Symmetry: D2
Subunit: 405 residues, 4 copies
């Protein structure tokens, strides 16, 4: 009877519902028709469109046949049970923040490698994926770009997922440095979000196998986090990174000298693996799904698959909060109060826990290496919405709570 109950609410007193009406109403919830959790429904709608005696009409029996396999998710979407029930209104707010941030033309595109330097400063995109799979994009959201340091929290969650907090943190610290030092007083890199930390974390993953097997193993995790949306690789960026990596070779030799790597590590191979991990490509859309997996406790919103352990996600979000934005980590944690991670390509992987994931991208960076438009957008998002980590959910002054209505 759930299919019947849904049928009557969409039909609006009519005997049959046109398929375009059902599809339009489904899209207004935030879900895409291409959502992996609605495939059985969409395949049945397509097949019935082929065999139907009607033009585009669906009676109670035909509707039941089409929607029965995905009735649970469809009932939540149509009964406004998603984390942001009025999704159309929220995306209109996102579009306003996107336009406001678009006006901030300052910053300098990264030019140490030609692959980053080629990007237009005007490229600006923002994608949202809620913990329920509601999607919204504005701007250049289907343009590939390298994750760069945005991969640091992702590989750290993979290390914690497989090894646990205790083992992983025998090699890397868990606090901000407060910085040019590679090691803290305990002779460990400060945290996984700095280069020395990321390099030590890279050395922890899938130990014992060649870099090709390690890379594939990581890629499978990223595919699952992104709901099998675009996760690619730029060998052009990789070759340039490995060529101009004096800074990372200094870290590598220092770490090896200070015995920072697990026994039996080949540091030169680990740096090579690290340069490969930085050169992984995403779009705003696919990377917003990875950030939504982090907002959703390790479950991929658009698939329902458990990708990461709750412990891996909590630790990752803890360290993104305090160490994810370089020298602006403390200011960002204070004013924005959201777990975020930036990369030198212009990415800002943003998590609003229990609500949504985002990817903001604009190549021009500020003097701290963070995307000008992304930083602007993040501040405006928290000015508008009660998404700050320490904003109250009952008493939030002139802020808007999109979880309300």
């Amino acid at each position: 009877s759930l299919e019947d109950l849904l049928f009557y609410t969409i039909a609006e007193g009519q005997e049959k519902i046109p398929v375009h009406k059902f599809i339009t109403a489904l899209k207004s919830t935030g879900l895409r028709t291409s959502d992996p959790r609605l495939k059985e429904c969409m395949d049945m709608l397509r097949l019935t469109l082929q065999t139907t005696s009607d033009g585009v009409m669906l009676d109670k029996d035909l509707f039941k046949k089409c929607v029965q396999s995905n009735i649970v998710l469809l009932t939540q979407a149509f009964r406004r049970k998603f984390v942001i029930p009025d999704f159309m209104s929220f995306t209109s707010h996102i579009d306003e923040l996107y336009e406001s941030a678009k006006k901030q033309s300052g910053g300098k595109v990264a030019d140490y490698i030609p692959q980053l330097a080629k990007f237009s400063p005007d490229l600006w995109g923002v994608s949202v994926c809620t913990v329920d799979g509601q999607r919204h994009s504005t701007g250049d959201t289907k343009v590939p770009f390298c994750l760069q340091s945005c991969v640091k929290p992702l590989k750290y969650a993979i290390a914690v997922n497989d090894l646990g907090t205790e083992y992983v943190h025998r090699y890397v610290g868990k606090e901000p440095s407060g910085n040019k030092l590679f090691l803290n007083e305990d002779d460990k890199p400060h945290n996984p979000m700095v280069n020395a930390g990321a390099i030590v974390v890279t050395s922890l993953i899938k130990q014992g196998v060649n870099n090709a097997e390690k890379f594939d193993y990581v890629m499978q995790f990223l595919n699952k986090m992104a709901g099998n949306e675009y996760v690619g690789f730029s060998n052009a960026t990789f070759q340039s990174e490995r060529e101009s990596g004096d800074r990372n070779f200094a870290i590598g030799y220092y770490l090896k000298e200070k015995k920072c790597f697990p026994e039996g590590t080949d540091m030169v191979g680990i740096l090579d693996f690290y340069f490969q991990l930085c050169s992984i490509e995403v779009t705003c859309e696919s990377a917003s799904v990875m950030a939504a997996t982090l907002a959703n406790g390790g479950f991929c919103p658009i698939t329902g698959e458990r990708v990461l352990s709750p412990e891996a996600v909590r630790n990752t979000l803890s360290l993104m909060h305090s160490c994810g934005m370089y020298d602006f980590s403390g200011q960002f944690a204070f004013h924005v109060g959201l777990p975020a991670k930036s990369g030198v390509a212009g990415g800002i992987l943003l998590v609003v826990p229990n609500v949504m994931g985002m990817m903001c991208w604009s190549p021009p960076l500020d003097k701290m290496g963070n995307s000008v438009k992304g930083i602007h957008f993040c501040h405006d998002l928290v000015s508008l919405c009660n998404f700050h980590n320490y904003d109250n959910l009952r008493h939030f002054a002139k802020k808007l709570d999109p979880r309300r209505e």
Copy 2:
């Protein structure tokens, strides 16, 4: 149709009249105290009718109609922790477990702190809805000490705004000795130099006595007019032995860290007075619940601090509130907290509740041994860590849900 009639039928359970003890027992089960300021009219009505035991529909309506909204919320399991009886049972287990952690050293730089028994141990809970639970030595007064730092920081932000306050003080941890950051400002409000500067921003232009009266009235509203006191014995000793604070004060003065016209010597005096403010676990748990409730005191419903003041406070308590254990605490516990040398840990679970954990023995980092152990246990049991997911939380308990 009448909310009072509806509530009467649920408590009566088919009977013509509800005995007063039955209603009081049921009310207390929700977590509310009969002495709750928002229930004053109901209790004054009950006392008048008690002067004349059985409450009929008419007498029940007459007693409860003034506070029917909150009473309906309480009886209809609409509070942040619906099954409060079950939750206070877990708090009691966590309390008994931390009770066995008898290690640490009671502070002995001043004799007022050194006098406190190491076996004094208390935990008080105040939810964002005013549900209360105490276990241990929760009515024994002790000095807030550095537990006052986030409270005076909240007052300064409340009255002056974020930008003005942060002209004088930073907003980040220093990273594991220096009084000033690269910008010649104390690192944050949670360290002594930062707190000393935050002290100089409050009620500028008036004498210390008026400033202290102003801060006391503020803490009274924050605690819902529950116990707030002052220990002159502690103030005299802190001042006599505050060489570290005098070194900071002269350094800040030399470095021009204070607003123009500051009397540094008078500011240090005010600062030692604020450190010597006394609270109980019970009254300090209400202060922490005002911070968990976006500035509204949960037992009075009063707007005490701006949402901005509270948000900034919790942010800096999260990263800077536990001295050298701040980074470890934010990672493992993930709750905004503030410890003091008297053994108090002011703990906030945003949107859920405030707490005051108190036991005088401190660890090598200056934090209460029992309190630290208790915070770790609380977050192992419940999905209260900042970055614990509210939908998928593994085998942890969520006291916000029914079953």
Copy 3:
């Protein structure tokens, strides 16, 4: 064996039967010695006394000359037979006057103005005084103008502490190395060295423990009087009262050291700060301060009195720490380029020592961004460019540098 007095007579007489008194005094002054030298008192009293009783006006025969000079014949023989460290002293003072005029053109810098007593001084005051390890003197410029020692007292009170307590006791409370800056304590929880404020404050607390500040001050004054050959050592109460009123920086150090248990047991920190401000307010002229520096250059013996003022241990330690930490943040650059133990103060003085050769006091109120006197800095660089006085200049193979210890 012919008389030493007769030998000296024949060399000054130049074949004549009698030497005129002005001839002997002119020849004496040309050595660098002053007639007012405390070691020549008996000679000068007898010259003045014989000038009253003389029958042949302005004439000294063999016997009359013997009568005057016999009491100080040893020093006079060294002076006249060119046995002093700088034998051609007139040529050397000519070079000093050239360096002085060169540095006088360096009118840059800012006079210290945190206390009105320092801000009062004219930027044009510039003096240079020399006192060799043999008592040879030379002054050019404003050498008789009193000014406070300020941080130039740091090596002197340190020398006093080592003289009385020894290296071991003193360095239990203070370090012996440059810091490398804004920290009051090193990794061992001690002030880095005695030449920084925290170190000087700690050294102040080691001197004459147990007695009041009046007895402590008098004790240090007696030492400074002997180091300066009983020449001008005064006190500026005006400067002292201003220093104690605006010494928040020093009060911060004081409470920090007291908190960190940096002082000897039973120290009254506020009284030590008070004594420390009094030590900073001690006044000297270029001349009297150049004698203090020459006592340090002469292994603890005062060159103009011959008196042992400090132990060789005290002097060696002071010069070691003046060389590496004496010029604030310019210490390393000064140690490398000038290679001379030196100490600067905020009044514009630079207490300079050329070990085994001479002491100096360069003074000009305008300071550079480091706190060092502009004229004094430039003068020190010119001195070492001209002369082989650098700590590590070779005394045998010194390229085109001049060596004033040689005849030519």
Copy 4:
């Protein structure tokens, strides 16, 4: 008018008509000079020819006339330490006192250093006039290691000048785990980062083979053509285990610390070769005496380094040459010295002598236990401290005086 050769003949003859060749040789050796002294070659060649027994006034003049000046200085006690025989007895006493200090640990990061016996101990003296004394294992080759740092820095300053060299390296102690000072330059040439940058300045434009040959020819002149070698075994081990130096190299390259057109990997290789240069105590004591003699080699009289190079080298050896013990050594010993991980201590007593102390066991700072003990005892005994007075020196001895 009477010949200097005849004059010297009469002072050695002692009323005799002829001087036996053994008497002259014995008398020359007591001055401190060795018969193998390169400035005495013409005298010794003449002696061997006339041999391949009795030398008359004519045969003595025939043998000594070419070197009469140096021989007259030696026999007329004109050398820097006139009573050299007495001085060498005090050195033997200091050597024997340090010999008993059996503590320390021989370096083992490379098997080449680890192979050395901890009982190996030698002390060599070469005055600025070429007077020689040796006690212990003074003819045993060992690697210079960081003892080469002052020597390559002297070469760099000799060839490029102070201004040029110091655009790449500082001139002060760091007072330390940082590779670069505030100005993005290595702190000084005596630390590893500084030495590596100094290495990149030597003979720019040519290959490492020509560069190494050039440094070797310079070290030959410094040592008066005495033993200077190379340990390829030490070199291959330093390359295999130089992670610390590769981290420095990549850091310097990233921070643009090298002159334009520098191949850093090739520079690190040249640096490992420079560290692997072997000397004996005797040959290295002559290098140290070239530094004590203002750039002139005492046993050849050749100008090897410019005064500027030597003055700058001694300034930096004074404050930077003993690692974490630099400041304590500058204060207590007051002498320009440079230590190496093989046990060497290149010691300079300006205007007096050069020395090489060698004993493989090192203390926690990396300095030779016996070498450090020896340096302290030498300055306890003699007024050799940089800030000892030459006139008033309490109970110390001045070997430069006759008695």
